[PDB]
């Protein structure tokens, strides 16, 4: 009863709900963001979730396992494999910075453990004065530069914690999971859920001289009529839905290749998606934003969110723990939990690449894991040391990449494979039938909507995207394009090796 409940609640908590979402909403004028977000959830998130479960199960029934191959099975065209490459590129690229963020959560957990945490400036009552110590904790941790300097200078502790995080991730990927998987996740997910609920409830009673936590909830759920005409918000919102639902990643597809063709995917898929939404908009969205506005004020919360991706909670949360009962211990627990939550997700975003190396190109587990780990570890130095690089990757892979790729999966699965064949595939084994209207949404509304969104988005933000020289971001654009070309090269090598016999 209670156990089954807390167990059901723990399945969806990702860093996407806590660290990422607050930053996405704040950078976009919260609530002006919520409308497109909710609309995207109903018109894009749910249908694609169902689509991914169907495609994954279908591909498992066959045995491809990766999007390049499943796409090839659905559409026999060399071009299908290339569009399919996004199913490896997106998760790999997200893994590159995602592992670093996880390392920040471990570092913070450690610092809270030792009681080395930021306390507000006594008797200062100045929102900027109040914000500087908390800003400094994160900034001193990752080593933010003064004056938009290209080079970032992370503290030694952060780097060592990164090394440890990689060692732990690799150590896990090589050997299976027995002592730290079910036995620990079954404790941490319910614990984290309970803790998060505690925090939402606690933060909402918070009211201070610089603002009120209530004002934060009002700020987040009050539509800004003005920002709706902004493509960036629509793209950001859809991108977040994709990220938070794990939807846009080839990981859900591969994981889904393990459930039987006759097993229901309609109720199960809808349940996972709905549970995920209730899991963030209510808990993650109701903690960090209200806390920052109550504490730092609106202007500072937005400025902090706009500072970079994931920054917001690393500041707002520690600020919150202060002035709270057993806040240092509560903080340690929160960040350690968060750390495990991140880990669970990173091995999952590495699984598409590992699986690709094993099924195609016929590589062992050791080699797939070691080469994948080598790529994330080496590449991550770009995100830890190059200013604005992390943000750029989080943008291209976790925001833009996923929506375009989502559209690709919808066209490939529904249009090319079969309107009705696709519907039939989704429908088999369902506990309930798919609502009649979604056939029409998926076939006409969702794809037209997304295509239009990307087009309107481009040429609004493209020229602005060509107008940005930080000297450190062009390295990242060139580099990630190179990585994409490299993966295309791996798919080419797989077909050459097969055709050679």
């Amino acid at each position: 009863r209670l156990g089954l409940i807390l167990a059901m609640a723990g399945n969806a908590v990702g860093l996407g709900n806590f660290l990422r979402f607050p930053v996405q909403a704040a950078e976009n004028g919260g609530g002006a963001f919520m409308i497109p977000y909710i609309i995207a959830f109903l018109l894009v998130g749910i249908p694609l979730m169902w689509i991914e479960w169907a495609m994954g199960r279908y591909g498992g029934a066959q045995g491809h396992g990766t999007t390049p191959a499943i796409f090839y099975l659905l559409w026999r065209n060399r071009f299908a494999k290339i569009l399919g490459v996004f199913g490896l590129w997106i998760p790999l690229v997200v893994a590159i910075y995602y592992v670093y963020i996880e390392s920040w959560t471990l570092g913070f957990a450690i610092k809270f453990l030792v009681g080395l945490v930021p306390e507000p400036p006594p008797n200062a009552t100045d929102p900027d004065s109040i914000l500087r110590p908390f800003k400094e904790f994160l900034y001193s941790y990752i080593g933010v530069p003064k004056g938009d300097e290209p080079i970032l200078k992370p503290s030694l502790f952060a780097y060592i914690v990164f090394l440890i995080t990689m060692f732990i991730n690799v150590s896990i990927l090589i050997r299976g999971i027995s002592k730290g998987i079910e036995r620990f996740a079954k404790i941490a997910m319910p614990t984290l859920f309970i803790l998060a609920v505690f925090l939402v409830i606690r933060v909402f009673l918070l009211e201070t001289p610089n603002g009120t936590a209530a004002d934060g909830l009002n700020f987040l759920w009050t539509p800004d009529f003005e920002k709706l005409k902004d493509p960036g918000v629509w793209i950001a919102a859809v991108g977040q839905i994709f990220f938070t639902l794990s939807l846009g990643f080839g990981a859900i597809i591969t994981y889904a290749s393990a459930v039987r063709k006759d097993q229901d995917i309609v109720l199960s898929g809808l349940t996972a998606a709905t549970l995920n939404e209730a899991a963030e908009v209510i808990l993650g969205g109701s903690i960090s934003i209200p806390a920052a506005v109550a504490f730092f004020g609106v202007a500072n919360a937005v400025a902090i969110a706009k500072a970079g991706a994931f920054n917001l909670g690393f500041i707002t949360l520690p600020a919150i723990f202060s002035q709270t009962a057993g806040g240092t211990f509560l903080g340690f627990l929160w960040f350690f939990l968060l750390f495990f939550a991140g880990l669970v997700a990173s091995i999952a975003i590495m699984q598409p690449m590992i699986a690709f190396l094993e099924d195609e190109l016929k590589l062992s587990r050791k080699h797939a894991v070691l080469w994948t780990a080598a790529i994330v570890f080496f590449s991550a130095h770009l995100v830890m040391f190059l200013n604005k690089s992390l943000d750029e990757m989080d943008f291209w892979a976790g925001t833009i990449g996923v929506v375009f790729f989502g559209l690709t999966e919808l066209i490939i699965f529904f249009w090319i494979f079969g309107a009705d064949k696709a519907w039939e595939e989704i429908n088999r084994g369902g506990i309930i039938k798919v609502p009649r209207i979604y056939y029409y949404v998926m076939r006409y509304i969702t794809p037209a909507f997304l295509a239009v969104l990307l087009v309107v988005w481009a040429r609004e933000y493209i020229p602005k995207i060509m107008e940005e020289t930080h000297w450190t971001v062009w390295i990242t654009r060139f580099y990630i394009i190179g990585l994409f070309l490299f993966l295309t090269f791996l798919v080419f090598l797989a077909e050459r090796r097969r055709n050679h016999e």
Partner: antibody
Amino acid sequence: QVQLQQSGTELMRPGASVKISCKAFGYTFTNHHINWMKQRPGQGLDWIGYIIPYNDYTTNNRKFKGKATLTVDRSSSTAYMELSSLTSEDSAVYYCARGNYGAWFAYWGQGTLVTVSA
Amino acid sequence: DIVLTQSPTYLAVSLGQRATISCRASESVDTYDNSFIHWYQQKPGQPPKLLIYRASNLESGIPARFSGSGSRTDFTLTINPVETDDVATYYCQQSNEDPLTFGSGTKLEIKR
């Protein structure tokens, strides 16, 4: 580069129980269904039943329903088949084979021999 | 269940000539216009060995000598030209309906 390695030959008194371990190497174990099949030396292959390594969740063919229990150790990347209520007719060669994600049965085990006699 | 009946149980053929083994099914093996019958080469002392999948498709590592054919119920495994090491029992399988079922096997022997 995938290898499936099976315990070996075993002798048992009729009515007893045995547990055969098919150990999986060189691939991500959770990604792929593992199938269990029975073959007499002079007979065609009967499918015993499969198991989904990620979620467990075995399915046995009607014929073998009570005589075969399929389990898995995810830590050691191993699949297990336990045969109970042994009889001479249970004496045969047993194969574990994983099709990719479950085409079927692309990679085969070396096989395991069971002799039921006193 | 779906029962697979294989034509000649024992087949003997001279070197360089073609061998045609057949497979018949009680129900259609086709779902979504795809034939789910699969062929296996098993030598004594060995496990089976996958030859052809989805009935028309040549598995890797297997020489082009092995070709799949047929549809609906009837299926045809064609080995031309037959080679010496191709002596073994050959099986067919149907994955379309669960559970899965196998043919009784066809033992090939060369005429020397």
